[PDB]
From a paper:
Isocitrate dehydrogenases (IDHs) are a family of enzymes responsible for the oxidative decarboxylation of isocitrate (ICT) into α-ketoglutarate (α-KG) using NAD or NADP as coenzyme with the concomitant production of NADH or NADPH. Mammalian NAD-IDHs are comprised of three types of subunits in the ratio of 2α:1β:1γ with similar molecular masses of 37 kDa, 39 kDa and 39 kDa, respectively. The α and β subunits form a heterodimer (αβ) and the α and γ subunits form another heterodimer (αγ), which are assembled into a heterotetramer (α2βγ) and further into a heterooctamer (the heterotetramer and heterooctamer are called the holoenzyme). In addition, our biochemical data showed that in the holoenzyme, both α subunits have catalytic activity; in contrast, the γ subunit plays a regulatory role, whereas the β subunit plays a structural role to facilitate the assembly of the holoenzyme.
However, we were able to grow crystals of the αγ heterodimer with the active site bound with Mg2+ and the allosteric site bound with Mg2+, CIT and ATP from a crystallization solution containing CIT and a relatively low concentration of ATP (2 mM). This led to the determination of the structure of the αMgγMg+CIT+ATP heterodimer. In the αMgγMg+CIT+ATP structure, there is ATP bound to the ADP binding site of the allosteric site, which stabilizes CIT binding through Mg2+-mediated interactions and leads the enzyme to adopt an active conformation. This provides the structural basis for why the enzyme can be activated by low concentrations of ATP. Structural analysis shows that ATP occupies the ADP binding site, and particularly the adenine and α-phosphate of ATP make very similar interactions with the surrounding residues as those of ADP. , the β- and γ-phosphates of ATP are oriented away from the Mg2+-binding site and make different interactions with the enzyme due to potential steric conflicts with the surrounding residues. Meanwhile, a water molecule occupies the position of the β-phosphate of ADP and mediates the interaction between the Mg2+ and the α-phosphate of ATP. As a result, the interaction between ATP and Mg2+ is mediated via a water molecule instead of the direct interaction between ADP and Mg2+, suggesting that the stabilization of the CIT and Mg2+ binding by ATP is weaker than the stabilization by ADP. Structural comparisons with the previously reported αγ structures show that the αMgγMg+CIT+ATP and αMg+ATPγMg+CIT+ATP structures are more similar to the active αMgγMg+CIT+ADP structure (RMSD of 0.26 Å and 0.56 Å for about 650 Cα atoms, respectively) than the inactive αMgγ structure (RMSD of 1.0 Å and 1.1 Å for about 650 Cα atoms, respectively). In the αMgγMg+CIT+ATP structure, there is Mg2+ bound at the active site, and in the αMg+ATPγMg+CIT+ATP structure, there are both Mg2+ and ATP bound at the active site.
Author numbering:
A (entry chain A): 4 to 46, 51 to 74, 80 to 339
B (entry chain B): 15 to 346
Write the structure that this text describes.
Amino acid sequence: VQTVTLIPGDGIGPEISAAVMKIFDAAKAPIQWEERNVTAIQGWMIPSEAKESMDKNKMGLKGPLKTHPSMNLLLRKTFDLYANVRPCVSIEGYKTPYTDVNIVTIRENTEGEYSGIEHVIVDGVVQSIKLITEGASKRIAEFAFEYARNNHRSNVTAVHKANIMRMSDGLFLQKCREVAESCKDIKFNEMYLDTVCLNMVQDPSQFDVLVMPNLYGDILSDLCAGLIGGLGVTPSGNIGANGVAIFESVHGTAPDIAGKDMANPTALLLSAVMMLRHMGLFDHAARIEAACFATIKDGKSLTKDLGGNAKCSDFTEEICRRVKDLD
Amino acid sequence: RHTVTMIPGDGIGPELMLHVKSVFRHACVPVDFEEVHVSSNADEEDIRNAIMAIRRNRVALKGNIETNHNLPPSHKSRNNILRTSLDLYANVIHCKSLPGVVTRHKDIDILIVRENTEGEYSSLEHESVAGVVESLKIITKAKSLRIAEYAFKLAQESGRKKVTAVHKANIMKLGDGLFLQCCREVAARYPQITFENMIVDNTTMQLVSRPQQFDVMVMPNLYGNIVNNVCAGLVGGPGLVAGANYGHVYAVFETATRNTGKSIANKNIANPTATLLASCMMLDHLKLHSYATSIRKAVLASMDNENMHTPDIGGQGTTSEAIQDVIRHIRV
Ligand SMILES: Nc1ncnc2c1ncn2[C@@H]1O[C@H](COP(=O)(O)OP(=O)(O)OP(=O)(O)O)[C@@H](O)[C@H]1O
Ligand SMILES: [Mg+2]
Ligand SMILES: [Mg+2]
């Protein structure tokens, strides 16, 4: 029975984190929580009550935070969360024009176009620095191939603009190619960013695991979320150094339904499922996952953002009810 | 008669240029094509000739020149070199739903105005220490105002109502921020145009769910690469949309998505629609509108027959069959 740091976040945050914990309870998941606010304080750091707690538990689950530096950026730097993982799979109860999406975007999360470095060269001339290093590219590439093996994925595509950015993207592509030659049971191709966008909105089923540097993954991960219904239903995890992982919602704070019981917990719930699979609790993952899918499929308790007329508590209750049926 | 430079390029470029010539002969178009080739060689002799020919003729029609990204950084994209030396600052594509090409979305009608010389395409990178590379995205006020001026004037002359600037100014506060700021400066002179802004991440999510909200879109170089290709996908793929590159004095026409097409070259399967439509934008630019309208209506009509469709739009027709059905509709 393991312990997980829980950061309910803001707005609808605490509501949906209570939903997740309640559903986890219905499922009898061997998981206990450790509620921890995080608020940027000076010394800019996260309150090390939580830093201590997460360094112990390793596993974390995080709600939406509101937007003076980015607190997601602080946690990113604090735990060295270098891999952003986004599995996008179509939801049978929620139909979009894309019904056969099963993609994992693996996004380098430390450098690239998010170096933090810009210069006003001269008034009206600005330079932004994209940073690619041999080490971060090697690590993200090793993570992608191990992820492909450890989740029985067959293909890994490196996405890049190395025709245009020969030295930066070309270095990233060189490291992927190097890991590809060592992990040859996972099949490897390379593809220009714009060809990936072009083909993605036409036939997303041709793609499996996608690994790319920071900005491309930032854009592509949201593109694929749009294929399957948006950020309200998209799980996400940031995997870091010292084994740490934090799984998170990427939707907004939604302060105006903040306490009106109309939030949608699906995304955080599916991130929690992702957490469970990361921890090895596959059975509890499968049951909670199926219960949420069946609820969405029904779908009498579709929350208002999924086109239904039903409060969060109804949606949450039914998932608990259904996961209780999977005995 | 006019003289136009033609760069066959690589992949499917040469074979499609031939079909362009055939259609021009059969339509009795008063245009002579002066060809310049660009080989695979690191030396810039050929690309320099092509630039100078385009300076002489001021109008070109080009295929895509292959960029081997395994060559050293010193060997730069010949497409980008030509674009930047001629200072063709506006890449303009018009993505519109084709009624005979049924995709997942209908009623798309987006004008994309992309900054075509600056940004992530400046070819500025270095290695400070071993295995630490920096690449320098450059945003300037003069080019950002230039592109925004094109986008607003285009919107107003076209009867469009809204301009949306696409950016990442929440992370690239100064670079993208300056780009936004120049858009806002221009917007002040076009108060009848609704001006909005959207983060590139969100833009892609909106494009694949409700692309009908967009009208005119303006953006720096890389974001335009991304958005051009999403939108081309939504309306049916790379074989359909023409692309224009405008400088103050020069104009170069090509397919919107700039694909070489090596894997389908010389198999008589490439869709010729985008290339023909670009050749019609060139004819329009030369003020030979009557020739443009004639070829454009034939090309759009052959698209209404699902049987003339090439495989990129779900059909099984070859390139030469499509060219025949274009020539058949050209009546004189
Ligand atoms: N005129 C056209 N008609 C049909 N398909 C096209 C056309 N132009 C480009 N494509 C397709 O668009 C895609 C991207 O173009 P790109 O130049 O990268 O192709 P490629 O490298 O030949 O593709 P592949 O990965 O299949 O070898 C390819 O699938 C190509 O076949
Ligand atoms: Mg994003
Ligand atoms: Mg190309």
